[PDB]
Amino acid sequence: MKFTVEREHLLKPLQQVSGPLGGRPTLPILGNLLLQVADGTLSLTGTDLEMEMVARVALVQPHEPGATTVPARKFFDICRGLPEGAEIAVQLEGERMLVRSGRSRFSLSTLPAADFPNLDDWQSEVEFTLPQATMKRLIEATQFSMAHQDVRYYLNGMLFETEGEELRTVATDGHRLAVCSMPIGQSLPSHSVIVPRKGVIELMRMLDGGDNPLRVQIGSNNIRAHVGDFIFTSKLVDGRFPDYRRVLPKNPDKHLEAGCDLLKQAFARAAILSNEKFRGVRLYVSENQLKITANNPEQEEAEEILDVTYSGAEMEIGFNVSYVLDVLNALKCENVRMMLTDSVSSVQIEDAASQSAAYVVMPMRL
């Protein structure tokens, strides 16, 4: 194995691929990046088995086919720590990988790759090329309820529902749910799949910009992406977890549009010396006003008064205020329309440009 890359070329893959392998996750070899000069290519691959990130780097710069695997860090850092552009002459030289800088030699420890597992490519039941932005539109304005972990099974990844042209995400943790949907127009045989969280992240890391039109292939097993040289495959839990349809304010009646941010601020101020037990702020919300009794058990209250375009019955509805900033902010939205229930149900925080984008939290009183 032998290649020469530039530090920078390498650098994208130097992150993508390395990133979730640093942890030396799983097996060592797994926690090593596969170095593969195979051909003129130099693919990098960092499998974990939890997601995977491949970065490719085309390499015409000196290379001898072979392969090696090196820890995710050992290598990365050296290359990075190298000055830029650096022609990182990497050589499996036996079992030390001689990483040659320019007058600073380094010798990493390298096993030739000969193992290093790699994931299911499968013909992906639905495949499509994302316009990306939607991906973040959604991604950001729906990952506030996704649990990380969640014994409520697979909330720790998102609920990739394909339904028609719309791709919907749902995350929920059980008290707060978010749906944002947008449309892709990619006629996606509906399904819902829980893709590993770690996945989501890496994805988001390879969400990339430059409207990298993110190719997706959801399977059910595997799901595969293509954003540049960064091919990311995950296994999938398929499944689904609930959606907003039900969460839905029993009163849509009450409305409350107001500027996300005035509101956010209001929340933000509100949440000060507010309830330490549940972030319960009982907002008594006039038809115009919004008045947040946020007490905290330390006998400190915060009160913020501010207009709302409020409608429907002004009522104290509690909330985990904590929830509410989360989305406010993640929600790219100006006015957020609330459509409140009285506090039995959630209130409909929606995006204005809810492309079906419902962001719903249940009451939480103090």
Binding site: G174, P242, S343, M362
Partner: protein, 343 residues
């Protein structure tokens, strides 16, 4: 608070949503049984969200939802097993216990399995406001006496005949061990094709998942059976028994023998065997030993018992196994008398 016996748990369970169905009792068979019945009917009752979460001696507490309208992503009532501390909920616990009493315990349908609470806990405010909605299920075990009855009803759990001749022999030998006795009846039922208990059959293969109590030995000793008692101990060895136990239990009977020997040499045998205790069956063995065992010859015996006890317990001398051989004959004095140098 209403005390219920597990077998009658349906009365309160069913009739109404008891808040804290407090299976305080201790027979695991009874506790187990009182637990699953609430749960079963609870889970059926829309409390499928069922979680178990102990209450440490630790302050503990976690899910203290008891109404907050937080859900509608997963709305329902839930139910919460609390395994109690040793004596029951302590402070913090009690506190957050008293909170729940205060609220719909919504989504926190209380199932408090455990043991008997401590008094102060039971006077502690939490255990005061549960009342009238909760159910205490005494999950405490049969006396020797009620044991056959129970056992006999319990046979029909297995429906097999069992044999009451056998029941007794189970009631004695599994005097007080419902659970294992329940499993006892199970292993053998399987073991045969027929699985029908009856005493002859239960002799041929005996459940090696259910104990042959100290009694066999010690009682054998009562009699004065200074060899019988000895044999049961050969077995109590191969069986691996902790010596502590043997001592403990032996101590139990013998001190009972002293005291009863003080008053017995002038009070009809065995009445006292149950005016105190001394099983029915032992009572005879026991009324004898008072006559056999004259309190004096009896003294040196205690001195050796104590000796061994200490050998163990302070000293962790594991030669208490040999010290006993002395004692058997020191105490019994043989079925007769034959009291000798201590050891």
């Amino acid at each position: 608070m209403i005390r219920l016996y597990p077998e009658q748990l349906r009365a309160q369970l069913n009739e109404g949503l008891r808040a804290a169905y407090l299976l305080l009792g201790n027979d695991p068979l009874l506790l187990q049984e009182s637990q699953d019945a609430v749960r079963q009917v609870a889970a059926a009752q829309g409390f499928e969200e069922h979680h178990t979460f102990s209450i440490d001696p630790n302050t503990d507490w976690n899910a203290i939802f008891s109404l907050c309208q937080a859900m509608s992503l997963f709305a329902s009532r839930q139910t919460l097993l609390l395994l109690l501390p040793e004596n029951g909920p302590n402070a913090a616990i009690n506190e957050q216990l008293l909170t729940l009493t205060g609220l719909l315990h919504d989504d926190l349908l209380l199932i408090v399995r455990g043991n008997k609470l401590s008094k102060a806990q039971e006077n502690a405010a939490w255990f005061t406001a549960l009342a009238n909605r909760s159910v205490q299920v005494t999950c405490q075990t049969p006396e020797q006496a009620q044991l056959p009855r129970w056992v006999a009803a319990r046979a029909k759990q297995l429906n097999l005949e069992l044999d009451d001749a056998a029941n007794q022999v189970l009631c004695y030998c599994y005097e007080g061990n419902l659970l294992a006795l329940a499993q006892a009846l199970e292993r053998l039922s399987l073991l045969w094709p027929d699985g029908k208990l009856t005493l002859p059959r239960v002799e041929q293969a005996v459940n090696d998942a259910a104990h042959f109590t100290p009694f066999h030995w010690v009682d054998a000793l009562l009699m004065g059976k200074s060899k019988r008692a000895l044999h049961i101990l050969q077995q109590l060895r191969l069986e691996g028994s902790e010596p502590v136990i043997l001592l403990r239990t032996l101590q139990r009977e013998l001190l009972l023998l002293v005291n009863l020997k003080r008053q017995s040499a002038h009070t009809p045998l065995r009445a006292l065997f149950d005016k105190h205790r001394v099983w029915q069956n032992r009572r005879g063995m026991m009324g004898e030993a008072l006559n056999r065992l004259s309190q004096t010859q009896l003294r040196q015996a205690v001195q050796l018992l104590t000796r061994t006890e200490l050998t163990l317990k302070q000293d962790y001398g594991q030669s208490v196994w040999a010290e006993l051989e002395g004692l058997s004959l020191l105490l019994c004095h043989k079925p007769l008398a034959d009291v000798f140098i201590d050891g």
